[PDB]
Amino acid sequence: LPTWSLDSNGEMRSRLSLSEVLDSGDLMKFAVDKTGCQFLEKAVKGSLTSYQKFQLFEQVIGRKDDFLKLSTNIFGNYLVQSVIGISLATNDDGYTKRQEKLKNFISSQMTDMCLDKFACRVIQSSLQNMDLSLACKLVQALPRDARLIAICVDQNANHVIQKVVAVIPLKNWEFIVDFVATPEHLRQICSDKYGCRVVQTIIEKLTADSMNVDLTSAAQNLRERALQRLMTSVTNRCQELATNEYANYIIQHIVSNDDLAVYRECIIEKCLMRNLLSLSQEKFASHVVEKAFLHAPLELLAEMMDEIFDGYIPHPDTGKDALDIMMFHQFGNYVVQCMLTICCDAVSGRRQTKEGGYDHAISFQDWLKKLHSRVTKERHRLSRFSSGKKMIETLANLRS
RNA sequence: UGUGUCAUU
């Protein structure tokens, strides 16, 4: 800090005024100092005269280099966000110029700011607070090449994309949806810890659910088309995605959401059906298989059940079947528990059995009887395992 | 007996 602002202890003076700091030309020293910025942050929340604001506007968001330096600073980024807020609240003759300048500063450095731990916060605040027409311009400044992948998978920058999706109309970021849906991009992004979160957020915003009822019908049509395009791409690679350590959450989200029912059915038909035994033995895809059992429409559920009970040839020597394999498998056992719980819920009326113009209770009773018969026959081996004890207890609870 | 994300003074 400037010596004029210090005690004989080398400690920032108390009773310092905002105007002293503004007048001094030393603001940049305060704004990057923990104690100095703390003072500024408190001072700018109080009453400010027109000239105090004018000075803050000039010194904090008025020149590109100082704006970037504070925006990328651990302490200064807070002051930048505060001053942007004051600027937006001050409708004097300088308003338009200030906001255009802010848009220009940010746009010109968009990628670098998004990737920065602190400046990404300035971006997010600006996107939700600036006049919408200007916030849309920021979105336009996002890169469209490999740098956009870097942004999507970045620990900081992914939150910028999530903010865009939250507070900007789809038309402005539809290019991101098309970018992500490119086969090679989808692969990279979905297979990333942060990238998969970005894709899930996009899917959520593109869903015609209770949160989108305020869209005009024209906007709904734009959304439906973008969703259809993204789902086509996801469906084209669902085997790869379902089995992946991160992308399996995306497939689960789609399968689990009633508002995505048509896409749920595509996925089940495209990569799960005929692969249930194999996928049930996978660390990540076994969770997807469970969701499919839990949410499939009755006709597909019947096909799935039929596949487990009768879809596979028993081992030529031992006579072990798919059910034997899954019940004792480290991941498969949870799929079998899921099947049983579904059937018990249905028969005990915890799950609605009417669908497709028919009451399918008879089907659930049938599947339940097959499970009960297997569990009975194999009760001794099953009782050796937590999963087996659980199934035995599940059937015991139903009887009661 | 089996997986992630949810990040600044």
Number of strands: 2
Proportion of β residues? under 5%
CATH H-level homologous superfamily name: Leucine-rich Repeat Variant
Gyration radius from CA atoms, angstroms: 29 Å
Q: Main β-sheet: number of strands, strand sense, barrel status?
A: 2 strands, antiparallel
Distance between the termini: 76 Å
Task: Report the top-level CATH class.
Answer: Mainly Alpha
What's the helix count? 27
In CATH, the topology is named Leucine-rich Repeat Variant
Shape: elongated
Helix content: 55-70%
- Provide the structure class: mainly alpha
PDB class: rna/rna binding protein
Keywords: FBF, base flipping
Assembly: dimeric
Entry title: Crystal structure of FBF-2/fem-3 PME complex
Structure explained in plain terms:
By secondary structure, the chain is mainly α. It has one domain (1-400): Leucine-rich Repeat Variant, CATH 1.25.10.10. It is built from 27 helices and two strands. It has helices spanning 18-24, 27-31, 34-43, 50-61, 64-71, 76-89, 95-108, 110-115, 119-129, 132-140, 146-152, 158-167, 170-181, 183-190, 193-205, 217-236, 238-242, 248-256, 261-272, 276-280, 285-295, 298-310, 322-327, 332-347, 361-377, 379-382, 386-399; strands at residues 354-355, 358-359. Strands 1-2 form a two-stranded antiparallel sheet. α5 (64-71) crosses α6 (76-89), α9 (119-129) packs parallel to α12 (158-167) and α18 packs across α19 (261-272). The N and C termini lie far apart (76 Å). Keywords: Cytoplasm, Developmental protein, Differentiation, Repeat, RNA-binding, Sexual differentiation. The record marks 312 as: Interacts with lst-1. One of its GO terms (cellular component) is P granule.
